[PDB]
Amino acid sequence: MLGIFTSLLSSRSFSIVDQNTNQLVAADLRISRVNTRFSSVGQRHMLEDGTTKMDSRTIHPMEIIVEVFCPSIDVVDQINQLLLDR
Amino acid sequence: MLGIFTSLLSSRSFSIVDQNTNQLVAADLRISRVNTRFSSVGQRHMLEDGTTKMDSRTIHPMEIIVEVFCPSIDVVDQINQLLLDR
Amino acid sequence: MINVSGFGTGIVIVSASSFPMGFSLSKFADDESPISSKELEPFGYEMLYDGGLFAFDKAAPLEVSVSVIAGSEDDINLRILLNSKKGSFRFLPGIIPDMTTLVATLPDGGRTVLSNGTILKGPAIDTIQNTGRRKGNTYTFVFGSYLGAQTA
Amino acid sequence: MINVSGFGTGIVIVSASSFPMGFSLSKFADDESPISSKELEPFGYEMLYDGGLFAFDKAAPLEVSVSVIAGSEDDINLRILLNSKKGSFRFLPGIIPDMTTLVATLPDGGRTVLSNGTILKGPAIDTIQNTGRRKGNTYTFVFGSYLGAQTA
Amino acid sequence: MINVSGFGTGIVIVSASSFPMGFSLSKFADDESPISSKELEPFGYEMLYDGGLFAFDKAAPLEVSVSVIAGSEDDINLRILLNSKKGSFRFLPGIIPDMTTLVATLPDGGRTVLSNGTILKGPAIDTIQNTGRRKGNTYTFVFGSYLGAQTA
Amino acid sequence: MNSFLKSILNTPTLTIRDDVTKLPVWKSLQVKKVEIYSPASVVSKPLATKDQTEAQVYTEALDIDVKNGKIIQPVRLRINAICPDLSTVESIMNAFNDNTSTFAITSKSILADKMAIMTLDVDQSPDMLNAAEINMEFEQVEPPV
Amino acid sequence: DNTSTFAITSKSILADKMAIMTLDVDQSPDMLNAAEINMEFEQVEPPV
Amino acid sequence: STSTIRTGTNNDILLDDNGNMVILRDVEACAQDVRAAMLMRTGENIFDVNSGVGYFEYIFSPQKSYDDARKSIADAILSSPDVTGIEQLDIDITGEVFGVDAKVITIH
């Protein structure tokens, strides 16, 4: 997407990294699509003359949807552990 | 639609009239569709034997939906003013 | 007596990065159509209720197909153009990296220039037929600018 | 004996703004049909649940395809007419930009007048086919008004 | 003079696990095309609401079809390749089971290597035409990456 | 079909201008669609009148009263675009995370001032190996004077 | 009218004491001299 | 519903043979008002900034699009006490001049 121009050939696409131990989990995931959604709601008040005013905006957490293929069993239960982690 | 038999050739199909001054507004509007909708709700009471009775009917305002094409810029300003008029 | 012959046609393609100076095509395949394009569609219409009509502008692309003899030098050059990667070649954005300009000439002498576009598709390897020959490769372009060059 | 020949036919095309005085068509192509058109269906019908029939009136356009010999003056005139973008100039209300009328005469003497229409399709660049010649360029019009005086 | 012959060409097919050492193809059928392929479209384009043109890069596969005389050794080898199920054995990370390499040599001397692909369709029992002969078996490959070295 | 011959008075270029800086931003986008919605609310109750006065007095009424019954709601603007580079993407997201960001959007001929981002989508797929699809929405903060 | 009732007869089905609830009208280039209608009725009271 | 004091082709008080400063009634008061409004320039009105036509930034300066001039002129035609809506703006720019035509709608 422009920006970085590295000339490194074998770079890496989407990868989840653990933020505690700087480790990759489920590194062998065949990714198909990535969708990122942002959302916010602006509260509006209905005035007297006939106009309509806005006073502030509230931001909610974003969401990411990933579609993958699992080429083995280890990827499947690695994904299960990824979800169950608390 | 039958009814009137004009014998006038160049007539007018659709026109918005300013009911105060009997004036045409946005006369240069090519039209793609015109839809007219009526609506009413009848209040029913649920009897004892097993029947069901209705006492009266209520009528809500009709709605007209028109799809147009604006061949210029003056028509766009005229449409915006038509909306903002109070 | 109108001469519609296609003998002596030459074409030059110049590129922004891959071929900054350009090359020329003169070997045009025999079995296939040496050059062709699809019909341009710059207008539209629709129907009203008074019975009338309404006409308006519309966006329109232009696609050109060029065929060459397999094994020719021009085939190698167009193959190089097809192998170019759009992601590479650092440049300013929004200016269609590696713009390719095509200049074509007729036997008469009329010259036409087309710009603002790039190569779009073409073969990757050669193809064998039952007759034992090799198919003439085809390459498709898309352009953006209709430089009105029909000079005498 | 009935004579149904087309030799000796002419077309005069005049546009509202681009070509105020009009130009003439004389060099019609030989491989593709000179004048073609599509069927006009200004009627429709619907079925009632008892099996009855109901017929109404419907809005219907007319389409015509005109082919010329490539490289002639007619070809360049139609190319100029095709490159006329509708963004420019100014139009009377309820008129459509470039209200073009086409008057075509049959060789017998009968004439037909078509109006309220524009140009849609055409070739941006010439096509060199297998034999080594140039394909006859074809263009399309759409009209919304009718006439015709087939006695003269 | 340009030489576009196909006689004297060869194919060597290497599979990751089923055929570690590879096998060769020499008997190409005569009723159907020996080597065929589908166009490569690594580019696309989209239209902008002002009428402009924007071109990007697209992910594109490569497809190849080969045909052999029914009942030869090449046909049985390709049948063995087709019956190999990806469920069995294993693979290195990011490799695809049975990464098949295909090396094609042109009769001139130039050659081409293709990798990261597999066989995906073909016949299972032989077809007997109404003339009393057997149709040439045709199998289709697919590949992810390619190369070209047309010097010799 | 040349383009870049844009007619005056209607030049189809999307210009977005920061409200305090008044300098154009995100000029790297390639937009494909623009939508404008301008709703309003209309009373839906039977309403009552005197109905026996002089004609012009009653004409004075049924005005002013109708003004009480038509109040204009904000303006919604939608666009669709493809973002080629990176810095534009992070600039848009930074503007999104701020509560105090306003912009003025200019379409072919329609001016809309004091807007604000409400929704934003980004999509990546094999259909575009070096770009991303965007879906941003704006909504007017305060009416003009 | 709040006080309108009709009896509708189909091929063989009788439905008495009905009343209009919904009505639609559409005008399009498909029909240049007619209009499409979508009426809806509902029974006011049961029969005896 | 409006009024003003009549002025000449140069914006001075115009006096009759009787010398009476005349209170013009509607319509021609609207014409005089709009003529004065379109000629007022931006940055001249004290106590009301951002009112006027931006001639030196939108028309006389080199400009790309020329919709800004239309918007500014339409706004200055508006803000008059009596104007309802604007029917047509053309903006010719033929020749060296900058041709502007306008037709407005009032309550009367």
Side-chain angles (χ1 to χ4, degrees), chain E residues 6-150:
Chain E
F7 157 72
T9 180
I11 290 294
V12 181
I13 295 170
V14 175
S15 173
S17 174
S18 58
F19 277 100
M21 302 140 303
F23 63 102
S24 63
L25 265 67
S26 176
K27 313 310 270 162
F28 289 116
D30 62 358
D31 62 358
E32 310 185 297
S33 302
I35 287 182
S36 190
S37 68
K38 182 175 174 66
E39 293 293 328
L40 199 73
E41 313 84 46
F43 296 124
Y45 78 116
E46 204 156 358
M47 291 294 223
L48 305 177
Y49 90 102
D50 69 350
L53 189 139
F54 181 69
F56 45 82
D57 203 58
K58 173 197 304 315
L62 181 43
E63 201 145 19
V64 178
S65 304
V66 310
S67 315
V68 308
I69 296 90
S72 81
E73 187 174 356
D74 291 331
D75 163 80
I76 77 158
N77 274 332
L78 288 172
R79 219 79 69 70
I80 294 169
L81 209 50
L82 174 78
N83 264 357
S84 294
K85 192 154 306 174
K86 311 194 97 57
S88 61
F89 44 71
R90 57 195 57 62
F91 60 100
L92 269 158
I95 301 297
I96 284 162
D98 290 328
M99 177 185 73
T100 60
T101 312
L102 182 58
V103 172
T105 79
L106 276 298
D108 188 359
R111 62 202 63 210
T112 299
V113 300
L114 299 96
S115 174
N116 285 184
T118 185
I119 185 166
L120 61 86
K121 50 201 293 202
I125 65 171
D126 62 358
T127 305
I128 306 190
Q129 284 153 9
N130 70 278
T131 54
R133 304 271 140 181
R134 309 224 284 262
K135 182 175 71 68
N137 295 320
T138 175
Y139 311 83
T140 298
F141 287 82
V142 74
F143 295 105
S145 82
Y146 63 72
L147 185 143
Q150 289 70 27

